[PDB]
Amino acid sequence: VDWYLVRSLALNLQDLMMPEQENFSQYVDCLMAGAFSGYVADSNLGTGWSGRYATYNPSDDWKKIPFNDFYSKFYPDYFNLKNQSDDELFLSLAELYRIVVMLRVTDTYGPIPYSKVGAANAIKSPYDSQQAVYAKMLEDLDNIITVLGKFGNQSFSSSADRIYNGNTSAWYKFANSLKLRMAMRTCYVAGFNVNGKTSQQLAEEAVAAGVMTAATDGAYRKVADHNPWQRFMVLWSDARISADLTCYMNAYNDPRREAYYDKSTFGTVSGNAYTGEESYVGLRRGILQGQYNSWSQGSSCMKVTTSDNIVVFRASEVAFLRAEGALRNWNMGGTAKDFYEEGIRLSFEENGITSGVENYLASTGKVEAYKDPLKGQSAQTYDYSGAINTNVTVAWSGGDFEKSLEQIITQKWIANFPNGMESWTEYRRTGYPKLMPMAANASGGIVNDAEGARRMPYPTDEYRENRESVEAAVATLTQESKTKRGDTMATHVWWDCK
Ligand SMILES: [Ca+2]
Ligand SMILES: [Ca+2]
Numbered sequence: 001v002d003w004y005l006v007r008s009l010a011l012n013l014q015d016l017m018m019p020e021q022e023n024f025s026q027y028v029d030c031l032m033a034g035a036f037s038g039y040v041a042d043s044n045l046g047t048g049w050s051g052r053y054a055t056y057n058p059s060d061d062w063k064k065i066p067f068n069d070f071y072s073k074f075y076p077d078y079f080n081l082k083n084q085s086d087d088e089l090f091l092s093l094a095e096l097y098r099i100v101v102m103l104r105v106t107d108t109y110g111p112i113p114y115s116k117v118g119a120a121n122a123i124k125s126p127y128d129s130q131q132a133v134y135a136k137m138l139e140d141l142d143n144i145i146t147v148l149g150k151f152g153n154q155s156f157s158s159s160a161d162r163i164y165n166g167n168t169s170a171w172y173k174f175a176n177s178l179k180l181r182m183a184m185r186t187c188y189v190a191g192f193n194v195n196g197k198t199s200q201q202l203a204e205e206a207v208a209a210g211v212m213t214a215a216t217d218g219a220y221r222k223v224a225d226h227n228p229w230q231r232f233m234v235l236w237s238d239a240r241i242s243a244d245l246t247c248y249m250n251a252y253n254d255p256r257r258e259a260y261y262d263k264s265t266f267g268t269v270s271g272n273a274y275t276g277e278e279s280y281v282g283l284r285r286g287i288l289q290g291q292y293n294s295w296s297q298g299s300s301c302m303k304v305t306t307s308d309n310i311v312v313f314r315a316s317e318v319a320f321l322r323a324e325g326a327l328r329n330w331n332m333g334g335t336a337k338d339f340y341e342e343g344i345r346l347s348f349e350e351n352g353i354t355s356g357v358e359n360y361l362a363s364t365g366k367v368e369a370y371k372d373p374l375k376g377q378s379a380q381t382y383d384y385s386g387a388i389n390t391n392v393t394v395a396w397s398g399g400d401f402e403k404s405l406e407q408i409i410t411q412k413w414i415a416n417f418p419n420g421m422e423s424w425t426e427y428r429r430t431g432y433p434k435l436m437p438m439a440a441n442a443s444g445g446i447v448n449d450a451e452g453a454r455r456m457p458y459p460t461d462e463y464r465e466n467r468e469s470v471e472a473a474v475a476t477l478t479q480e481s482k483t484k485r486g487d488t489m490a491t492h493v494w495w496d497c498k
Pocket of ligand 1: 323
């Protein structure tokens with residue numbers, strides 16, 4: 001057995017949960033998920049991009065990357081590892097990475113090639129319904145949890161794991177935390193069960209077995225070369241913090257502002273022509289390419305270095321998932337209020353904030369209108385001011401289900417930055433947090449402004465290379481949906497049925 005190759009393959013599979021490769025990450029995590037989650041505002045002042053995901057008009061090349069590139073990058077190594085190793089622990093971890101990676105893909109598209117992927121050309125296969133994908137994943141995850149449990153306090157080679165350094169018990173907590181994330185995801189699907197286990201049952205089992213409970217249980221990958229966000233934000237200035245994120249965090253006087261990003265640098269960018277003040281202020285999402293104010297890169301920028309860890313799965317997310325389950329009257333091991341406050345405390349700890357959580361927890365600050373700081377400035381033609389329509393605040397009020405769910409999800413959304421893939425999925429599922437619509441909707445009427453993008457359409461090339469399977473997939477997508485809008489960004493995937 002060639003351990004050197006097996007370690008190498010395991011490492012590449014692990015990476016694809018939250019990819020490091022800057023030219024892959026930029027599309028899937030920054031340009032796509034970052035826009036749709038409400039976290040990132042594209043700030044490229046060039047004419048080279050014909051359109052973007054944010055304005056609902058990406059090019060055919062951009063539409064190929066979040067589908068095809070996951071299959072090209074994941075499956076050759078996955079099939080190779082299965083031929084190179086018979087070790088139950090390494091095969092269970094390889095399957096766990098497959099579930100997390102393909103969870104992003106089914107949450108982007110709906111039906112996808114999964115159970116019938118060929119070793120020759122993985123994507124050139126029949127598509128499973130999203131329900132069949134979730135059912136197979138949840139069933140395989142139960143077996144992975146059993147395998148990780150029996151290894152208990154045994155450790156594997158730290159060189160094959162840049163997240164938990166071979167600590168199997170940390171992977172056990174991650175796997176049960178994923179099980180709770182997927183159980184909560186399917187909570188609106190009437191009669192959903194996996195071998196008789198309902199969403200409630202899967203969630204209760206995960207919590208009883210052992211999920212992440214401490215900030216140090218969180219999954220953070222030590223970069224192999226550099227954190228790609230340093231490129232997107234600092235070096236290239238292709239991305240800025242969204243106006244939505246600074247609207248909520250300013251209203252709550254959030255001390256995580258200093259942990260996440262910096263104050264604006266309009267004076268620098270303007271050559272001191274800027275007459276306003278510097279503050280925590282993001283850029284409007286969905287500004288049409290070619291319609292930016294020239295001082296737009298003066299907007300708040302992420303605080304990030306090349307050596308910063310990649311955020312894979314935060315422990316604070318698990319506490320907010322338990323808060324939601326407790327709100328749904330599931331046995332989560334405590335009240336909705338206790339897990340809500342625990343999620344906020346865990347997020348403060350994750351961001352190195354040692355004081356002021358008790359004052360933050362009592363905060364009743366209300367979200368105000370977004371005032372574009374460049375409005376009326378020299379040679380700054382555009383005004384991207386707008387308003388988030390919400391009364392959500394921090395101080396736990398209890399009572400009304402929807403108002404409590406909005407608190408839980410809004411606080412999960414602040415804590416889960418910069419994990420846009422997860423936050424876009426949670427925005428679609430619950431409707432929270434309330435976000436501003438895109439400044440420019442270039443979908444031609446396909447995408448509704450209040451709903452935003454609900455999915456990505458299948459790449460046009462897949463209709464030409466795999467027509468029968470893709471046409472059957474669009475038929476499956478329609479049959480599982482409760483908002484049938486064809487193979488477009490407007491169609492709701494199977495779990496998106498609130
Ligand atoms: Ca069965
Ligand atoms: Ca804590």
